[PDB]
From Swiss-Prot:
This is Sodium/calcium exchanger regulatory protein 1. Belongs to the calycin superfamily. Fatty-acid binding protein (FABP) family. (9Z)-hexadecenoate binds at R125, Y127. GO terms for cellular component: cytoplasm; membrane.
Length: 133
């Protein structure tokens, strides 16, 4: 999963609105989030990670150690317990709360595929790399 490092910008999205409805995001915030073109900046040092997700209206920042449970507050404001692990090509962010959700990221054919799963909803968001320097 080491190649997730760098900067990424959203290229395509499928079923994000239903994902947000399932986790309880309100109407106005869904309007903003659906229209957004977020960037993700991912840094990796050994088993230490950070991920900054930026939009014009909201930024989230998390930092963690692979395998170590930590407190996360999501962009929409849910308090959850998160554990991240590496599974070959993918880094999986397993979120416990109300509701639970699974977020996976992996690079394929040069693009970061982020799959978000909650209850019976699956959302796929594909990011293109932004070259740094
Ligand atoms: C900075 C990101 C905040 C986006 C607005 C908050 C609304 C919904 C958040 C749902 C959980 C996080 C989804 C992340 C999707 C993605 O990174 O493309």
């Amino acid at each position: 999963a080491a190649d997730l490092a760098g900067k990424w910008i959203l290229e395509s999205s499928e079923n994000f609105d239903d994902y947000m409805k399932a986790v309880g995001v309100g109407m106005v915030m869904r309007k903003m989030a659906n229209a957004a073109t977020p960037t993700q900046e991912i840094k990796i040092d050994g088993d230490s990670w950070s991920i900054k997700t930026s939009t014009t209206f909201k930024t989230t920042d998390i930092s963690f150690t692979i395998g170590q449970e930590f407190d996360e507050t999501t962009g929409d404001g849910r308090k959850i317990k998160t554990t991240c692990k590496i599974d070959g090509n993918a880094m999986i962010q397993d979120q416990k709360g109300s509701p639970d959700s699974i977020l996976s990221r992996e690079v394929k054919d040069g693009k970061m595929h982020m799959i978000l799963k909650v209850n019976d909803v699956v959302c796929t968001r594909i990011y293109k790399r932004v070259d740094l320097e």
